[PDB]
């Protein structure tokens, strides 16, 4: 038999880094007022480009070149067009969630 | 499991929850179970009324209650009829008898609850305790309180 503990484990009022990690993994929703797609995609780009993974990120996202900056990466994702930088950030977030960027 | 049936009217005898409510040893601060109204009244509130016989020139407004004993047979200390009309339409105010002061309202009698008797009273005479308009008294309880000398206690 199993007993469930309803309010024992819960993020609640989290920290900045914890909230970024939860939104990047999809645990918490992305709030357009407090926790922006821009900030979480900046966090994803930073944690990816920490090491020499820029060319691999470009290969995963089908980019013609290795991105130098987060804005350049978002613009290239838009070019790969009619979509907006908001849609590009959403695509990057969803790719990181599905694992199209690699195991991390 | 086993179910039985007992009417609530059999338990109504135990409605009061204290000595003050069961034996009426003090003021009923909005906690009264049994009420006594005149046989035939449908709107259950007591009525302290006045008789109007003339215009404000000949008969003053406080002279309507002259048939009642007490302070209504004296002229008040304060008069608010002249000048800006009061927001609550208080026309007169008698002298403070301890912690109680008697006022006279204008217009139809406002239905309030006297904290001493516990009844809803519709009258123009309101006695305010310690200038706090949450605790009001009908004129009958006001006259009785002054008669016994409990003006500074209740």
């Amino acid at each position: 038999v199993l007993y469930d503990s309803p309010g024992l484990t819960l993020p609640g009022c989290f920290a900045k880094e914890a909230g970024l990690k939860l939104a990047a993994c999809g645990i918490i929703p992305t709030n357009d007022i407090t926790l922006p797609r821009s900030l979480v995609a900046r966090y994803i780009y930073d944690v990816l480009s920490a090491a020499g993974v820029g060319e691999h990120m470009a290969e995963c996202l089908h980019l013609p070149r290795a991105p130098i900056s987060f804005d350049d990466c978002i613009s290239m994702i838009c070019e790969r067009g009619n979509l907006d930088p908001s849609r590009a950030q959403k695509f990057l977030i969803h790719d990181f969630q599905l694992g199209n960027l690699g195991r991390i | 499991n086993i179910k039985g049936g007992v009417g609530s009217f059999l338990m109504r005898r135990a409605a009061p929850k204290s000595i003050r409510q069961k034996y009426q040893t003090g003021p009923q601060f909005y906690k009264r179970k049994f009420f006594q109204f005149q046989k035939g009244h449908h709107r259950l509130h007591r009525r302290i009324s006045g008789v109007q016989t003339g215009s404000p020139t000949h008969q003053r407004e406080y002279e309507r209650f002259h048939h009642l004993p007490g302070d209504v047979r004296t002229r008040p200390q304060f008069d608010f009829t002249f000048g800006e009309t009061r927001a609550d339409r208080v026309m007169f105010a008698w002298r403070k008898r301890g912690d109680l002061q008697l006022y006279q309202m204008s217009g139809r009698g406002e239905t309030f609850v006297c904290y001493r008797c516990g009844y809803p009273v519709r009258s123009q005479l309101v006695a305010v305790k310690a200038d706090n308009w949450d605790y009001r008294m009908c004129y009958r309880c006001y006259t009785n309180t002054v008669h016994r000398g409990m003006e500074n206690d209740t």
Binding site: - | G4, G5, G7, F9, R12, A14, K33, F35, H45, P120
Partner: protein
């Protein structure tokens, strides 16, 4: 299309009891109301009522012989009933001694009646003749007659008056006539049926009869005892009307634990000037030291298993039965307990008398009775069989329904290994005396009895078990009124099923709110349907409370003021509350107007829906 009547004022039904609650029942089942709003029309309780009291026995006039009788009975402070009733009876007035169970109601009328006989014997010097007694006592049962004879013998030993009693025996007509021929008596403690037989047989005459005491008068004056007391009192009344013998004003005293319609009307109509001594704030309620416990049994068969648990819980331990000889001896050999005060106080855990009373209080669980500015300890039980055996266990009486259930439970407990004694009327005279003497002396701590042991028995009963839930509160109070006597601790266990769930929920509720068990029955429709004027009273109070809550906490606009006061602050009468269950409390002419509008709008909406489907 079908649309019910929407507008309603009251959907239930009102009882047809116009007089008071439970007007359809007989007085033998239901208790009468003691509120002044109800007793205002009663022929007995609307009249003079004695409520003043006398503090001490020294403040009331008593002869030295009565002073010694009280010291012998170890009684110092009078109980509230004795503080009020002793003075009225000494004034030679027809008195209704009304008091709960175990408050000194017996001595309340025995002291003044005995003193009046002493005054007639010494001051007035009225001679005592052969077949003309002075006082006649009336009791329902045989054990109560023997108990009343015990108390009158303690008083008669000091006062010098001779009391006589008689129950049914073999060759009773012979033995009763010899008593009337051999010894002179002035107190006759007998049954009203038998004393009526002696009067018609001309063995006892109503001459110089000055006092008639009726114990348990609520039942004696009812049809449960064939109106034998009522027929006797009418013969006594015509004796007073007789003006050719010496003027005797025979005063009549009624000792009652209950007040019913029979008692009120038979005394209020026949005794116009009758003083009633009663405290209505304590009359129809159990004692304060009584603990009630209602144990529900899911199956009727499992009732015996629950009873055996209560016996083991209170020390009564059955002997083991493991062999065939012990199984046969369980029903053949009547087993008896053995012990004494010395061994019992060692088991539980001048100076000689103080220690005997200290142990007596610890065993009987005697607590100091608390009256206003007066506290006392309960006197020893006035039973004609003194307890001489003291075994380890709590004493109990198991009240059952009918004789067969009492007999059956008696044999079931014996087969289980319990020392019990059976008591009912079908038993022969020799066995009936032996069975009661076994329990009252201490050889047996379990009494399986019928309702015969429910009225007037002052025994050491630690707790009472209602094996069958009583059908009314009158029997419930009388059964439970055996274990708590004069402030002693008592406990009651009532085993009930679904068939008595209505009265159990009623009694359990009345006890928790500390209310009198008046108007309680087992009919669910009777306990749920109120009277119209009583519903009107509680409705008016509920409306006024909603008005107070509406004024003091709610602010209402002008357009909503009319409807708020219409639904929360207006008393709206009903239309013909007798036929409320038909028209819902609304005039059918108004209902017709309401139904016409709703039906028209319902038909128009239906025609559209049918056309769309």
């Amino acid at each position: 299309i079908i649309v019910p009547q929407q507008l309603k004022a009251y959907g239930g039904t009102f009882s047809r009891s116009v007089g008071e609650r439970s007007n359809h029942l007989v007085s033998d089942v239901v208790l009468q109301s003691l509120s002044p709003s109800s007793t205002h029309n009663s022929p007995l309780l609307s009249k003079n009522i004695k409520t003043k009291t006398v503090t001490s026995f020294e403040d009331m006039p008593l002869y030295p012989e009565l002073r010694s009788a009280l010291r012998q009975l170890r009684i110092t402070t009078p109980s509230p009933i004795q503080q009020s009733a002793v003075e009225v009876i000494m004034q030679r007035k027809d008195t209704v001694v009304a008091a709960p169970h175990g408050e000194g109601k017996t001595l309340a009328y025995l002291l003044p009646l005995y003193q009046n006989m002493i005054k007639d014997r010494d001051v007035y010097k009225i001679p005592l003749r052969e077949r003309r007694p002075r006082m006649i006592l009336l009791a329902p049962t045989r054990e109560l007659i023997a108990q009343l004879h015990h108390v009158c013998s303690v008083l008669g030993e000091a006062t010098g008056l001779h009391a006589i009693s008689f129950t049914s025996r073999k060759r009773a007509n012979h033995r009763l006539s010899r008593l009337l021929k051999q010894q002179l008596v002035d107190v006759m403690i007998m049954d009203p049926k038998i004393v009526l037989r002696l009067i018609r047989a001309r063995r006892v005459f109503l001459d110089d009869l000055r006092y008639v005491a009726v114990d348990e008068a609520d039942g004696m004056l009812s049809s449960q005892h064939d109106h034998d007391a009522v027929h006797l009192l009418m013969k006594v009344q015509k004796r007073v009307m007789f003006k050719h013998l010496w003027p005797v004003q025979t005063q009549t005293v009624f000792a009652t634990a209950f007040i019913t319609r029979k008692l009120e009307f038979v005394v209020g109509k026949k005794y116009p000037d009758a003083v009633t001594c009663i405290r209505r704030q304590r009359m129809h309620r159990p004692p304060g030291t009584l603990r009630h416990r209602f144990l529900p049994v899911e199956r009727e068969r499992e009732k015996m298993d629950t009873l055996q648990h209560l016996l083991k819980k209170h020390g009564n331990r059955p002997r083991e039965i493991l062999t065939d000889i012990e199984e046969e001896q369980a029903y053949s050999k009547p087993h008896y307990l053995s012990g004494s005060l010395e061994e019992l106080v060692e088991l539980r855990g001048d100076n000689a008398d103080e220690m005997k009373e200290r142990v007596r209080h610890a065993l009987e669980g005697v607590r100091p009775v608390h009256w206003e500015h007066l506290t006392t300890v309960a006197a020893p039980f006035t039973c004609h069989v003194p307890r001489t055996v003291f075994a380890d266990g709590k004493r109990c009486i198991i009240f059952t329904r009918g004789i067969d259930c009492a007999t059956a439970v008696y044999h079931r407990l014996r087969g289980c290994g319990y020392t019990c004694s059976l008591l009912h009327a079908a038993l022969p005279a020799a066995v009936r005396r032996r069975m009661f003497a076994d329990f009252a002396s201490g050889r047996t701590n379990i009494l399986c009895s019928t309702d015969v042991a429910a009225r007037g028995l002052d025994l050491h009963v630690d707790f009472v078990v209602n094996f069958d839930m009583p059908t009314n509160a009158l029997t419930y109070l009388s059964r439970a009124g055996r274990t708590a006597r004069q402030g002693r601790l008592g406990q009651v266990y009532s085993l009930y099923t679904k068939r008595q769930g209505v009265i159990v929920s009623a009694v359990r509720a009345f006890l928790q709110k500390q209310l009198p068990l008046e108007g309680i029955s087992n009919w669910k429709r009777h306990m749920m349907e109120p009277r119209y004027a009583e519903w009107r009273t509680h409705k008016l109070n509920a409306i006024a409370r909603s008005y107070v809550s509406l004024i003091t906490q709610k602010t209402i606009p002008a357009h909503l003021e009319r409807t708020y006061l219409r639904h929360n602050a207006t008393w709206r009468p009903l239309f013909h509350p007798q036929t409320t269950g038909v028209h819902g409390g609304v005039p059918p002419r108004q209902q017709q107007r309401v139904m016409d509008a709703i039906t028209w709008k319902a038909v128009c909406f239906r025609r559209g829906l049918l056309a769309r489907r």
